[PDB]
Amino acid sequence: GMFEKQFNHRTLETSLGPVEIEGPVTSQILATYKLDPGLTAFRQPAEQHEALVEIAALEEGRIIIARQGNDIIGYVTFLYPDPYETWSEGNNPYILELGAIEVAARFRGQQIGKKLLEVSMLDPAMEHYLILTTEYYWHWDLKGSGLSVWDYRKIMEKMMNHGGLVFFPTDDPEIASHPANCLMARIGKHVAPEVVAHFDALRLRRRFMYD
């Protein structure tokens, strides 16, 4: 939150491209764009657009977008973990959540996710955060992607790996409920051991049973 947001930009060529990959984008500017109709994995586009704008308005919030003209065909979000999920416990401002990352189905296979993550990490400020993320099978567009759950998981994980995120075991009930779900996290080069220890305490939450 206390850090400044460095705007970065790269043009990604695609079979439909080129696509402008840039951010963090301000709320004022995000409101002028239009979410592509095919970005409905979390909620309908009108509601999800309002959600991206709101996130951008947060002190720590960052919205990086994949864009063609006024049309957002993909995005990736960053903000502090949800107050009503386990990842927000304690007073640790060095823990940031990669909320979500979504890309219109027709743009799949053009490595937009990879770049979306690249441009997100171009800001040296990201090295000061431990960036965790959660992925659940029930938000994945398997029907549209044609992928089984495990092929999807393998592809999605390697995408996240390109952004520096790595899989971490957890005893979190929701994630643990299905092996395909996962917690991943990117530990910035400048992140202190205390922050990492806190993260370990969050993901292995029932340690007290064994203390």
DSSP assignment letter at 59: S
Termini Cα distance of the chain: 34
Asked whether position 111 contacts Ca ion by CB under 5 A, the answer is no
Candidates 27, 40, 68, 88; binder of Ca ion (CB under 5 A) is 88
**Contact positions with Ca ion (CB under 5 A) in 15-74:** none
CB of 209 to Ca ion, least distance (A): 23
Instruction: Tell whether residue 77 is a contact of Ca ion (CB under 5 A).
Output: no
**Nearer of residues 100 and 117 to Ca ion, judged by Cβ:** 100
Residue 95 to residue 176: CA distance in whole angstroms? 21
* 8 A C-beta contact, residue 23 and residue 125: no
Q: Which CB atom, from 48 or from 134, has the smaller least distance to Ca ion?
A: 134
Angle value at C-alpha 39, between 173 and 172, nearest 5 degrees:
10
Q: Output 28 or 196, the one with its CB closest to Ca ion.
A: 196
Residue 205 C-beta-side C-alpha neighbours within 13 Å: 15
Q: Which of 134, 152, 172, 184 binds Ca ion (CB under 5 A)?
A: 134
> CB 87 → Ca ion: shortest distance, Å?
8
- Could you give the CA distance from residue 104 to residue 124 in angstroms, rounded to a whole number? 28
Binding site for Ca ion (CB under 5 A): 88, 100, 134
